[model samples]
Target: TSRRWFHPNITGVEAENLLLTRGVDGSFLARPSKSNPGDFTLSVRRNGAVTHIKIQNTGDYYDLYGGEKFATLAELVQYYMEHHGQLVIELKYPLNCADPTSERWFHGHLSGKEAEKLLTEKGKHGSFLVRESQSHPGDFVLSVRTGDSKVTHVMIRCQELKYDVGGGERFDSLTDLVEHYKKNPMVETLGTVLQLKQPLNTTRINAAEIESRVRELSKGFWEEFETLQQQECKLLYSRKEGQRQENKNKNRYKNILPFDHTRVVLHDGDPNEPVSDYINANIIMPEFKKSYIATQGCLQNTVNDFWRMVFQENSRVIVMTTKEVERGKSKCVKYWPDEYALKEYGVMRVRNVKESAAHDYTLRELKLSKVGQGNTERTVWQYHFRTWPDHGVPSDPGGVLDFLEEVHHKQESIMDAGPVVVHCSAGIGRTGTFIVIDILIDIIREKGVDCDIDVPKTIQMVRSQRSGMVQTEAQYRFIYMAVQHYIETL
Candidate 1:
């Protein structure tokens, strides 16, 4: 009955720009054509591009160019949402219409009974909340406790024209109405007094409104990263193994060290050499049964050790989010052999079976085997992403997501594969970002769209496995948008 998702005046170009910049993949908006205001167009963003679908209004019915007929535009969109066959695109996130995330008390949909339980159990006396009404679509309800007895549900009627508290005064806004009554308590028809007190603030929001939540939590993307940086200051973990005098030169950066507890120790190195087992890598388990080895880029001296760790861990997948040489500096050494060639590293021999390019990444099929292992060998694949800059995050996250979409297919298919080896120059910034994004992406894929994901917490947990993940503010910000874009595509 309502066209809340429709914008009456925007043109096709305006819709495309909005969906590209502000909207993620699967995010959409409905707007009318410039020539005929009666007709409408549905614009959706997917895989870094936008597609516009025209809605044909044939007098009494609305249809998507005549595929499915509906009495209303809302029904047509809803039907496409459930069955995304013809349009080939899902309506996951609606663009924007009365997103109430700016208000702390606006819980999107809380039943009256749920509000009462929350106020009585978790909140104290005079605790209050505002939520969307259960019976009405555009209406809101104020749930408040007067004297620690019970919650009183006050319905705020929304007539599109104005907001009114039942038959009382019209305030035009929910905040205005709530504020007006706070100064003056209301008396019910049965002489029951309802006092508005402290509000129980909620950080929870609708799944589609996660962009605003990210904006709020990130404080425009600066505060959250700084806060994470500050929180990382309290450290008691030791790094004596990586800081050893012999292993110092093996590291790409002197200060960057892997923790001893989670560090990967080489197995094929010399037993007499005390530094044989040393490698600048840490095993990260984002969740149980989920494994990722976050390590530094391979150095000239540590190239053998890099192969040593991969062999020891039985890791079949390797992800490099850095270029061999970036900004005239050696970000990572060329440890693998060239196409159709072979390279011997200490006790291990590697063969570059095949190499192929996929958009922003390169795939190398390499086989690793020992000197005395006969013909039995293990297969390994390295998905090398070179689009990232030397210092900051990528300009567009869809490139990385596009690259990752190809990586994860082979990343998980193996039966008993080891941890996926992920590394950048220092192994803290881009490495952390990739691991965290993959971890959260798997979670969202398994649990569907409505699953709750905290990017800050995910990095925090990853850091505990290997210290200093998701280094820059831009890297952290990229994680949110990358996940947002991925959710839209599905």
Candidate 2:
């Protein structure tokens, strides 16, 4: 029924008739009050208790009992229908129908605002009785508030049409529950969290700092150098039994050992065979990029294995840092053949094609073949540095850098070639120094003269891949001096 009234007030008979239509059956009377014009006093009885309600017209809005205001009588009627249970009224059913109040009796639907009010009044445990879930349309999720400002989710299992709570397993909160379920073996998790890897530090350094660091490194560098070698000996890979056996097999001296982590494993097709399997070599990653294979010179017994590795890895360039024999001592065995001379080692055949002599190094072109395969032939370039001495740094870095640059240029021309094979005698001393110089010079070229370079960090990175890299203190100092000299040129 419409509640829009033409006048602000109604007569006593009119008010009584309106209240009767709204289901107010108790003894009540609506009488005109003399204190306020156009106002009526409503005295009603419910459950043998009497209460008074004043209905007043405030022009724009109608004021009911207390401070409750409504735009029309229809709104007041609706409010009374919703809250009538809270007023003093007799109940046909008992208030507590079950012991401790079962949640099954709570069938009333509540909005988000109403649920919040119920949670605030009752504590966490009490609020769980009537909590409704927003995710599951008709289901509910039970939660508890902790001493801290955290809410924990209680796992629920459904059986037959009834909901059963978790036995006693507790989760930190909803977030913890979600993370656990995401990794649960029985459930399929569709969400994932991604983490990014940290980038390398390529910060720039000035010329003055480079000169100062090299000067400081020259003082007591040998003592610190030995300490680094001893420290490197403690690595797990350095202590492997295979390395101990390798030391006995190919090492020219008693003290030199190949790091087990970087040792090359030949694709011998048979793991049980030991022949053609031993070569003292390490894979070096400069600037965290796979670049070169630092290895020992070919031994009399391992020459066949050396060519096998070269063909397998598809290497095109070989940088020989030491002469075959130096100062009347055998340094490296001749791995190739002389001009027009043919040599055979196992399944491989080698023949020299072209030879060019230079001031600092010699470039040789050699052709390789398989003994049984007639048409399969490969050509390899060998750069032999005749000037570098074993167990010592070069007197001048320019000639070494120039030779390395030419080698690099040739390597870049062949896009799919494997790593460049670099070797001296023991492989870690001069071999390590050459690799470090080339890597530092590369960084200098890309980053410019003022680029910050951490030479110690860079050397440490190389040593991580191959133990005893930059084998001597003089070789270590030479890296700084070489880099400093190159930067001065720029």
Candidate 3:
């Protein structure tokens, strides 16, 4: 299709400088367009032979001689040089003038010195540029400041006609190329920046927005939660083979699946035997050093498996969020031994040496040992919360936080121990809530109260590693409330 004449945005001096720098042996004369008063034309000449290209003040491609059209001024210049090369060289000068503004001369094939010079100039103009690979530095990337609050990186590949701006995109002009990145910044580029440094204090955490988010979750959380559950429930990794059948009839409603990738694999007697390695357990590592084993309350048959996991994982602390029975229903099987009581499960023996009860939780110090090997012994701390109701949140988030703070303190004391074991019924609702709160608290404490805390995003991260994390809508809201309460104290 035919398009309107293209106009050069720069002045005659700039065009002449660009042409000379490109070794075109030509000059451009800018004059008003005869067809359109609002538009203009550039009379390009080489060896006294002239050609006129129409230029527009705005919009569309430029018109060239013989009714041809070009999207950019460089394309039109390249066409003239290619078709009329002999004519242009005949008019070429002995000494080629340098054109700093001509991108074509440097396109896809810039020397190290040239790249450094270009980057320095860009940096002076308030745009930041860096080499993509420092060890083998050749390609350069620039973070251009498009607006007051907007910046985007553009990768400069040497020896190519077009520059890459993420995806499979390529642009002939650096200006247009960078504008593409500016308009649509790649997630990978943004993620790299996010990983390298912390965010500056530009916008404070809005208390009202936080409250509104919690309110929305409280009002319509089930709908969203159910939608996610349905979508994720289809995968084979979402549920294991034999574990689903082992769940009690009463616990069926709470019986959600765990993703295979992050699911805790139990050590079996036979390596090749599949057995029932599925224990409704997931390993969550919110920070580099801190980790947690989030799992479900023990089932009747899986009681031994739970203890085996603790022994296998070398877990030093176990935080139980539910009682043995909640509201006359078996929420969790009693997996620990009574004071001075010795319990045997498989090849391990657990003896409770001390028991201390509190208003909300009980603390027990249990010594576990492999039965046959008397020398193999490990001490484990158990924090069993008696007050947390099944399928419900704590009335006072402060109380929950207080107990959790103590748990954190104990876990921090034993820095060499394995991940802390956390569980409640089904291991998705209360377990997820506790893990999220613990992570957020640490994040705020480490980064500061004003640091950006994305509660929903954090929940999504947990769910990605374990299916049905923060299971219920109410549980999701409880996480926000807990985080909000913690922030208030901060």
Q: Which candidate is the best by lDDT?
A: 1
Tens-digit lDDT track for model 2 on 1-490? 2211111234545554444454244544434353453354554545444445677642212356553543223334333444553255322211111111112212124444554444444333222322445555654454433331333334344334444445433443332332344354221154322111111121224544687766755663433343243334224244253335543556543334456777676775345564445566777777763378888778787788888778777788899988888768777898889977888877778888889999999999888887877875777889999987533467677888789889988887876888889988767667778888888887777767767676656776787776456654567767777887877676
Give the alpha-carbon lDDT of every model.
0.74, 0.57, 0.58
Top-TM-score structure, candidate number: 1
Q: Give the TM-score of candidate 2.
A: 0.53
Model 3 Cα displacement at 275 (Å)?
A: 2.1
Query: Over the stretch 331-397, how does candidate 1's per-residue lDDT look in tens digits?
Result: 7989999999998998889999999997788999999997786974888999999777654567677
Q: How much RMSD separates candidate 1 from the native structure?
A: 18.0
* Residues 82-149 of candidate 3: C-alpha lDDT, one tens digit per residue: 46533333322222222112221123333345455543433232344333433334544654332223
When 2 and 3 are scored with lDDT, the better candidate is: 3
User: Candidate 2: lDDT over CA atoms?
Assistant: 0.57
- The C-alpha RMSD of each candidate to the native structure, in angstroms, is 18.0, 35.9, 23.0
* TM, every model: 0.60, 0.53, 0.53
